[PDB]
């Protein structure tokens with residue numbers, strides 16, 4: 001046989017986990033990262049996927065694809081698609097109602113369906129697993145947001161099929177997280193769980209009611225255009241202003257300088273979740289000018305204060321829809337890389353009047369973790 005894996009196919013980052021000997025292994029990639037960007041890039045000589053693709057976006061903007069999760073299973077005439085595409089640096093065409101990403105690979109013009117792009121990311125996760133396990137991976141459980149309709153779930157299933165993966169089941173991300181913490185164990189009564197998911201580009205809030213192991217999504221709220229990337233932006237715009245003030249040079253026009261600065265910001269942001277300040281060191285940011293400076297956790301929180309605070313509005317709504325009070329929810333689990341931000345943790349905890357948050361499992365790995373367990377039971381290994 002071969003172990004069934006659990007795969008989190010996120011908008012910005014993906015993750016693969018496997019259940020073995022009662023424990024879940026979150027598999028690190030070639031670069032030793034526990035999560036890998038959902039990026040694909042096409043050049044004159046090759047197809048790059050994951051870290052290698054993200055690590056060269058500043059050079060190949062028009063041929064570096066991302067955000068395929070926003071297209072998958074949708075129609076070209078979709079209002080969502082129409083709005084979104086006005087921001088992607090890559091081409092999106094209409095092939096008989098179905099949207100397609102168009103890129104140049106080896107001088108030749110090629111187009112791909114969103115599911116084909118996602119299959120590429122899925123193939124990378126699969127080989128990462130296989131490289132770790134030292135055996136071929138066939139069966140898998142792939143996750144999807146609770147709000148995905150049948151077409152989107154269909155497309156996600158298909159993306160898996162072309163990747164050579166036998167998708168055992170498509171389960172919701174909120175359910176995957178709950179299972180990771182064992183909140184699916186049959187107790188004697190009804191359990192209301194609140195899943196607070198803030199990733200790279202999306203924000204979801206789901207309230208689940210678990211009784212006899214059976215889940216029931218009572219409500220969902222959030223924002224599909226609020227994520228860790230928005231926090232990076234605030235830093236970027238802040239440093240562009242600082243560069244301009246200190247050097248009288250506006251670097252906004254130079255798409256490369258900006259993208260390089262953003263990469264520095266996103267990294268400094270992570271450090272800020274553990275330290276109180278981080279330094280930005282960028283050689284030749286603009287012209288021959290090096291950009292050496294730093295931010296504090298204090299300044300960082302200030303730059304995103306409105307964004308952090310507004311995160312509570314969707315929480316209030318989810319509650320009222322589900323017709324529950326703060327006191328009625330028994331468990332709160334954090335999901336998504338962005339929830340590692342201290343201020344966000346304080347803000348949510350304060351809202352739930354001190355209630356302890358579930359966050360012992362890396363928030364950005366929780367979904368894969370749960371999927372891996374679910375895969376195990378479905379396979380017959382648990």
Ligand SMILES: Nc1ncnc2c1ncn2[C@@H]1O[C@H](COP(=O)(O)OP(=O)(O)OP(=O)(O)O)[C@@H](O)[C@H]1O
Pocket residue numbers: 009010011012013014035198199200201202203227228229266269270271273335336337338339340341363364
């Ligand atoms: N220590 C940290 N502090 C803050 N943000 C972090 C930290 N570690 C990772 N991140 C951020 O988390 C985000 C990635 O989150 P995650 O890996 O959960 O995304 P995902 O599921 O692909 O995203 P999405 O919710 O957009 O589909 C990025 O914005 C990254 O900068």
